[PDB]
Amino acid sequence: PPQPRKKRPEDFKFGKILGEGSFSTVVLARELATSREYAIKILEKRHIIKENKVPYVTRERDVMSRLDHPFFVKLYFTFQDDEKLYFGLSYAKNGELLKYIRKIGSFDETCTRFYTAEIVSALEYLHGKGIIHRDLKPENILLNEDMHIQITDFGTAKVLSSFVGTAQYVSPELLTEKSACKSSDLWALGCIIYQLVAGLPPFRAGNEYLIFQKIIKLEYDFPEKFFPKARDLVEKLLVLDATKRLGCEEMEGYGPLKAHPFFESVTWENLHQQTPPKL
Numbered sequence: 001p002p003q004p005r006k007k008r009p010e011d012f013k014f015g016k017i018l019g020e021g022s023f024s025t026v027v028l029a030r031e032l033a034t035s036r037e038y039a040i041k042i043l044e045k046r047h048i049i050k051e052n053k054v055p056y057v058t059r060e061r062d063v064m065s066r067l068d069h070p071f072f073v074k075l076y077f078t079f080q081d082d083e084k085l086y087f088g089l090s091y092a093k094n095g096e097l098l099k100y101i102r103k104i105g106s107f108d109e110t111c112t113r114f115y116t117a118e119i120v121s122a123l124e125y126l127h128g129k130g131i132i133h134r135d136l137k138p139e140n141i142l143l144n145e146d147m148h149i150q151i152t153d154f155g156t157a158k159v160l161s162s163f164v165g166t167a168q169y170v171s172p173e174l175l176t177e178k179s180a181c182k183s184s185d186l187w188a189l190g191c192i193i194y195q196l197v198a199g200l201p202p203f204r205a206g207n208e209y210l211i212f213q214k215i216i217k218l219e220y221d222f223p224e225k226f227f228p229k230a231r232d233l234v235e236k237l238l239v240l241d242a243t244k245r246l247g248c249e250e251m252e253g254y255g256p257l258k259a260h261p262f263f264e265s266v267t268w269e270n271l272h273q274q275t276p277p278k279l
C-alpha cells in the first residue's frame with residue numbers, strides 16, 4: 001500500500017540535543033504538520049563509511065523495523081539528505097533510567113520489582129525474535145512520559161542464525177570467547193537489577209582492565225541492605241557459565257525466570273497497562 005512520501009529536514013523544527021555518541025547525535029524535533037515530537041538520530045554518512053560502521057547502521061535500522069512492542073523505542077521513518085541519515089524515533093520525554101538511579105540513589109523493592117519486570121518482559125519479546133541487544137544498560141533504558149520503559153540503541157544488536165559493550169556490563173564469555181548469545185543480555189540484566197538495588201553496578205574499578213579482571217573472577221558482593229529475594233535472583237543471573245543463567249534456553253527459558261519469588265506479586269500479561277510505582 002502507498003506509504004507517506006519521504007519526510008525531509010524542512011518538515012521539522014529541530015530543537016535541543018538529546019544524546020550524542022561517536023557516530024551519531026540525537027536531536028529533539030517537532031514535525032510542523034502534526035505538532036508531533038520525535039527524537040531524530042542523525043548520522044553523518046562520510047563518518048560512517050570512513051569508520052566502517054555501515055553494517056552497524058544497517059543492523060540498527062533492520063532491527064528497529066522488526067520490533068513492535070511498547071517497551072522498545074520505535075523507528076517511525078528514515079530519510080537522508082546529501083550528508084546525513086535521519087532516523088525518526090520515539091521521544092522518551094523522561095530520559096535515561098540512569099538519571100533516576102542517580103537522582104534517588106537506589107530503588108525501594110516495589111520500584112525495583114516493577115521496572116525489573118518490564119525489562120524481563122522486554123527481553124522475553126526481543127529474545128523470542130532471535131535478537132540480542134548486546135549492550136543493555138541503564139543509559140539505553142529510557143523512560144517515556146508515562147514512566148514505562150522504552151529500550152533503545154540497536155546498532156550493536158545481533159540477529160541470531162565481534163563488538164564489546166560497556167565495560168561494567170560485559171559478560172564473562174565476551175572476555176574469554178569473543179562470542180555473545182541471549183545469555184549475555186541476562187548477565188547485563190543481573191548487573192542492572194543489582195544497580196537498581198545497590199545504587200551502583202556490581203563490578204567497579206579504576207579502569208577497564210581491572211573491571212574485566214573482576215568480571216571473569218566473579219569478584220563482587222552484596223551490601224547488607226539488599227532485598228533477599230533480589231539477591232537470590234541476581235546470584236542466578238550473574239553466573240560465569242552462560243548456560244546456567246536463569247532465563248536462558250538450557251535453564252528452560254523465561255517461565256522459570258518470571259516465576260522467581262522476587263516477582264511473586266507481578267502480573268506479567270499487562271505490565272504496560274499498569275500504573276508505575278512513583279519514584
Ligand SMILES: Nc1nccc(-c2ccc3c(N)n[nH]c3c2)n1
Nearest residue numbers: 018019026039090091092152153
Ligand atoms: N537508537 C538510539 N540510539 C541512540 C540514542 C537514542 C535515543 C536517545 C535519547 C532519546 C530520547 N530522549 N528519546 N528517544 C531517544 C533515543 N536512540
